[PDB]
Amino acid sequence: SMEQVAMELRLTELTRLLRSVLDQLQDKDPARIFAQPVSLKEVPDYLDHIKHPMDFATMRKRLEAQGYKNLHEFEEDFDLIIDNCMKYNARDTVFYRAAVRLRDQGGVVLRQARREVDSIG
């Protein structure tokens, strides 16, 4: 149907905008602490602590399969990256502190992304 195509075009354009958002958030992580999944070879107890691991590569795979239907879904995954780290790692660690800085800096990007998603529809 033509309606299905129109919906698919909207999803494609959301995917374009989320790709730009993802790039901007990941620039706020110059140390690349959040770039890849926590290695279960190197942290074998991780899943005992963290039930839903997340990282920027995993988000990028979902994104390129057009797997985010709305901004809320995308934000959920970004919040997991932050929140998982702030639980697993103590306050005095470079990991925790990196997550705080990512959250603070990402807030700015996400605020304007929400306006754009609503504005363009």
Taking the C-alpha atoms of residue 117 and residue 107, their distance in angstroms, rounded to an integer, is 15
Taking the C-alpha atoms of residue 92 and residue 49, their distance in angstroms, rounded to an integer, is 19
Tokens 């970004």 — which residue? 78
Q: Which residues make Cβ contacts (< 8 Å) with residue 121, sequence separation at least 6? A: 10
Length of the chain: 121
How far is CA 66 from each of CA 24, 109, 121, rounded to the nearest angstrom?
18, 20, 17
User: What domains does the chain contain, in order, with CATH numbers?
Assistant: 1-121 (1.20.920.10)
**DSSP letter, residue 53:** -
Please state how this structure was obtained: X-ray
